[PDB]
Design an enzyme around this catalytic site. Structure first.
Site, short mmCIF file in Angstrom:
data_model
loop_
_atom_site.label_atom_id
_atom_site.label_comp_id
_atom_site.label_asym_id
_atom_site.label_seq_id
_atom_site.Cartn_x
_atom_site.Cartn_y
_atom_site.Cartn_z
N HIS A 31 0.82 -1.23 0.00
CA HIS A 31 0.00 0.00 0.00
C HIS A 31 0.85 1.28 0.00
O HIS A 31 0.32 2.39 -0.19
CB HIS A 31 -1.07 -0.01 1.10
CG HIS A 31 -0.55 0.36 2.45
ND1 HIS A 31 -0.25 -0.59 3.42
CD2 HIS A 31 -0.35 1.57 3.03
CE1 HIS A 31 0.14 0.03 4.52
NE2 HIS A 31 0.08 1.34 4.31
N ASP B 4 0.01 -7.63 1.73
CA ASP B 4 0.47 -6.23 1.76
C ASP B 4 1.99 -6.17 1.92
O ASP B 4 2.53 -5.84 2.99
CB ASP B 4 -0.26 -5.44 2.86
CG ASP B 4 -0.01 -3.93 2.77
OD1 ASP B 4 0.53 -3.48 1.73
OD2 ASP B 4 -0.37 -3.22 3.73
N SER C 274 1.19 1.28 16.40
CA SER C 274 1.65 2.02 15.23
C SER C 274 0.48 2.85 14.66
O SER C 274 -0.67 2.72 15.11
CB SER C 274 2.26 1.08 14.17
OG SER C 274 1.35 0.05 13.76
N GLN D 148 -0.75 5.95 11.18
CA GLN D 148 -0.49 6.57 9.89
C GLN D 148 0.95 7.10 9.79
O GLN D 148 1.42 7.80 10.70
CB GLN D 148 -1.46 7.73 9.66
CG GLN D 148 -1.14 8.51 8.40
CD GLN D 148 -2.25 9.40 7.93
OE1 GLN D 148 -3.17 9.72 8.68
NE2 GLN D 148 -2.17 9.80 6.67
N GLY D 149 1.62 6.81 8.68
CA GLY D 149 3.02 7.24 8.52
C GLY D 149 4.03 6.18 8.94
O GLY D 149 5.19 6.24 8.54
N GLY E 19 4.44 0.28 6.30
CA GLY E 19 5.56 -0.31 5.56
C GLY E 19 6.79 -0.58 6.41
O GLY E 19 7.71 -1.26 5.98
#
Ligand SMILES: N=C(N)c1ccc(/C=N/NC(=O)c2cccnc2)cc1
Ligand SMILES: [Ca+2]
Length: 223
Positions: free
Chosen positions: A40, A84, A172, A174-175, A178
């Site tokens: 994503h 993902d 965890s 947003q940001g 990954g």
């Protein structure tokens, strides 16, 4: 990262920042030429930033290297976030040292209860919005598959696991997408998704890296 701590400069030497004019995702360095991130996080024009602590200040240990190619998992579904995972090849090999280092891939999957280190430059607030400049860290246990599925009915596949705290407050966000989940020195997870951040009964959901080791190795071997 919500409810975490300041990692300390270059204490997480496999942590990368993906930059497209600005930080937008984390990633994990797995050898001198390859980074693992979330599918994503895919976009064109990625520059991989290694050796980062403060992502807004050049501090002396950075290596900035453009991506030469990205490979999204063949079975990635952007609606369900199943599979993902994405590989990014660097245009040139990173110079590996104490502060820029690869992280080992797992040889077996981790179990519920294993403690892991999750890291990134994502939002630090569960309600509002505040983005840190320096790398943040969270120690969190892998949760049982049953509690994970109970938290997110109809959404957890065999390629996902939950980690964190059902009570909320530590997650965890947003940001952080990954970025790594490292357990006993192995990359077991990738920051993938969740409902809000640090919400009660809504732990973080992570890509189950041990499922992808065969694909990663063969992909690297031919690219
Ligand atoms: N709770 C977690 N562990 C968690 C939750 C969410 C995420 C990812 N968020 N991304 C976003 O919101 C987003 C990103 C870009 C554009 N519009 C929205 C990661 C972890
Ligand atoms: Ca920097």
């Amino acid at each position: 990262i919500v409810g975490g701590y300041t990692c300390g400069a270059n204490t997480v030497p496999y942590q990368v920042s993906l930059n497209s004019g600005y930080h937008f995702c984390g990633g994990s360095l797995i050898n001198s030429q390859w980074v693992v991130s979330a599918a994503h996080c895919y976009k064109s024009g990625i520059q991989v930033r290694l050796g980062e602590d403060n992502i807004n200040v050049v501090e002396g240990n950075e290596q900035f290297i453009s991506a030469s190619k990205s490979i999204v998992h063949p079975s990635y579904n952007s609606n369900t976030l199943n599979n993902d995972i994405m590989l990014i090849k660097l245009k040139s090999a990173a110079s590996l040292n104490s502060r820029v280092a690869s992280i080992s891939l797992p040889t077996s999957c981790a179990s519920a209860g294993t403690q892991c280190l999750i890291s990134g430059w994502g939002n630090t607030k569960s309600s509002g919005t505040s983005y840190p400049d320096v790398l943040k860290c969270l120690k969190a246990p892998i949760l049982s598959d049953s509690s994970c599925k109970s938290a997110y009915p109809g959404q957890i596949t065999s390629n996902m696991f939950c980690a964190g705290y059902l009570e909320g407050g530590k997650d965890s966000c947003q940001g952080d997408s990954g970025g790594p989940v490292v357990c006993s020195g192995k990359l077991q997870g990738i920051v993938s998704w969740g409902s809000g951040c640090a919400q009660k009964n809504k732990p973080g959901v992570y890509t189950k890296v041990c499922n992808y080791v065969s694909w990663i190795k063969q992909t690297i071997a031919s690219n």
